[PDB]
Amino acid sequence: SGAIYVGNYRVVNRHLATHNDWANLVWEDSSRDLLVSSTTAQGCDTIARCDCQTGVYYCSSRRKHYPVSFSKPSLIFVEASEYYPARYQSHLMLAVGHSEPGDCGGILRCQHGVVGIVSTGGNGLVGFADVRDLLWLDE
Numbered sequence: 001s002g003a004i005y006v007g008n009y010r011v012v013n014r015h016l017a018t019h020n021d022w023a024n025l026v027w028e029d030s031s032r033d034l035l036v037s038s039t040t041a042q043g044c045d046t047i048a049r050c051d052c053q054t055g056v057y058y059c060s061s062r063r064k065h066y067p068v069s070f071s072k073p074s075l076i077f078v079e080a081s082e083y084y085p086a087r088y089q090s091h092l093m094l095a096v097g098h099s100e101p102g103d104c105g106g107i108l109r110c111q112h113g114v115v116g117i118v119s120t121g122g123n124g125l126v127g128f129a130d131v132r133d134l135l136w137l138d139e
């Protein structure tokens, strides 16, 4: 679990969005596994606006942060799960690292701010949904 809180927005994995997220829906994209909802309180997270390919992510299944080198956001095949049929997930970045069910929502950060959230894993890999292209989160 986990979310990004920036301005009057909450960014979560679309497959973990709650009834309240859908009632206050701003934007969602099944191909990216992202959903953004509106909030009443101000969020203070800073979104990175950069092309960093190194950062640190939080892994809830280890209660630890790990440094990672990750690929540029791209279209990657993701196997069928109870949440989605087999498909290409867009804007996904892969890295070598531990990730298991329950880790989605952990933040990946670089020196500039929040880069994205855990969205996929297994086999010693971890996949992050990028949020750096969503410039409207800042306004």
Ligand SMILES: NC(=O)[C@H]1CCCN(C(=O)[C@@H](Cc2ccc(F)cc2)c2ccccc2)C1
Pocket: 015, 033, 078, 079, 080, 081, 082, 083, 084, 089, 099, 100, 101, 102, 103, 104, 118, 119, 120, 121, 122
């Ligand atoms: N973005 C997606 O489509 C996710 C949705 C949840 C599932 N998902 C994952 O990759 C799971 C692994 C998994 C489990 C059962 C399956 F039938 C297929 C794959 C996972 C997420 C996070 C960290 C480690 C593993 C894709």
Ligand SMILES: [Zn+2]
Pocket: 048, 049, 050, 051, 052, 110, 111, 112, 113
């Ligand atoms: Zn950066």
